[PDB]
Design a protein around this ligand. Sequence first.
Ligand SMILES: O=C(c1cc2cc(F)ccc2[nH]1)N1C[C@]2(CCN([C@@H]3CCCNC3)C2)c2ccccc21
Length: 241
Amino acid sequence: EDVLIPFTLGRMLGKGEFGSVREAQLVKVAVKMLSSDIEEFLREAACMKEFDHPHVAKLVGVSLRSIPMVILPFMKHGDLHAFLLASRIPFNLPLQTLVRFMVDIACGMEYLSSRNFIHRDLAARNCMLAEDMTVCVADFGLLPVKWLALESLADNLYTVHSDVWAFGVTMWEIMTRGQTPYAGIENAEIYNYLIGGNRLKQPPECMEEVYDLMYQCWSADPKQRPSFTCLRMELENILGH
Ligand SMILES: O=C(c1cc2cc(F)ccc2[nH]1)N1C[C@]2(CCN([C@@H]3CCCNC3)C2)c2ccccc21
């Protein structure tokens, strides 16, 4: 398949548990550094290559070094979490801009779920800012306890409904401008917090109707959480008002 790529590596862009990222010249790109495991990587790489949507990060391709590598378009504006943080610690964005980020993410997630694709790691840090400042869902997954639904934590179940829960957490991050969810509560106590009936609190300035929507995303019953289509409609209406 025209997905595999035989470029040269450049400056280090960042690193983490997932591995490291560096720029490369193919066109400037971002390159993600990571038997059986290397097998399905390639398998799922092929399905991700056919994503084609304005609010989903394109896959340029994949490659092999001697570690699996993911080749991505270089997005200079970086990720949404870093941007929200950079507003706070200082630019100011109207409510309109914050709700528009949510609409953008809801469109890309609507598209992914329409293709039966479960992200599993939706969070502000995994949303990228494009040149025109639109947001694109990224990092599809070729532990993040604070974004995980009850049934993901308890039963390891990942569905569109658990993607929707993490979308709700992402809405909260947007409204708090990049604050760590459940700050001062440890990962090991998150489940206990949640089956308690406790949720992330309404941010001080947050429009009630925006909080009502994100709150819906954290229903204990996965079937009670709105769809991405319903999220996008409600967010677009809010944006129009
Ligand atoms: O274009 C860049 C990029 C990196 C980068 C680094 C910079 F310092 C400045 C601009 C940048 N642009 N990247 C970075 C990632 C790969 C790893 N991801 C991190 C993983 C860890 C969690 N956050 C997300 C985001 C990405 C996905 C899709 C399309 C492009 C890009």
